[PDB]
């Protein structure tokens, strides 16, 4: 019953690989249910074509903002933003898919995939999914990041959907 979504990542047009995730809708519903419905394209907007604007080697990969493509907005399925579901799940290690909010109770479409144990985020960022396959794809696309987040190259979600 736990959704599984995927991302087909490209580096400057050239297809690179696939990254799937397991959405924990069992524990974090409104958040998980949110990510699934945007990974598919179930409303017209979603993550297809959007990119990872903020990648920081050894930390995480930020994406989910299809509107502004910088970090400003990005709408969810419930109009614009939504409250923090909970903090039951903690950023235990790399692969951990979490929401990239801007001050409590402001979750939209921005998420980040962890590339290391990031405990300091526990309690501030709503964890809701985890890379199932492709953590080596997220590693490659990580190399194309920097320190302030600037991408050394254009990383994109060339295609996305639900396989389960």
């Amino acid at each position: 019953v736990n959704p599984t979504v995927f991302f087909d990542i490209a580096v400057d047009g050239e297809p690179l690989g696939r990254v799937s995730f397991e959405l924990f809708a069992d524990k974090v519903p409104k958040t998980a249910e949110n990510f699934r419905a945007l990974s598919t394209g179930e409303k017209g907007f979603g993550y297809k074509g959007s990119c990872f604007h903020r990648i920081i080697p050894g930390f995480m990969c930020q994406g989910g903002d299809f509107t502004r493509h910088n970090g400003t907005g990005g709408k969810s399925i419930y109009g614009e933003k939504f409250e923090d579901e909970n903090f039951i799940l903690k950023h235990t290690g790399p692969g951990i898919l979490s929401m990239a909010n801007a001050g409590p109770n402001t979750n939209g479409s921005q998420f980040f995939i962890c590339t290391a144990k990031t405990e300091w985020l526990d309690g501030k960022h709503v964890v809701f999914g985890k890379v199932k396959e492709g953590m080596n794809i997220v590693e490659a696309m990580e190399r194309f990041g920097s320190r302030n987040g600037k991408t050394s190259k254009k990383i994109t979600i060339a295609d996305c959907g639900q396989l389960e």
């Binding site: 920081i56 930390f59 970090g71 909010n101 402001t106 939209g108 921005q110 980040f112 985020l121």
Partner: peptide, 6 residues
């Protein structure tokens, strides 16, 4: 902007 810090 949105996003977690290190």
């Amino acid at each position: 902007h949105a996003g977690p810090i290190a």
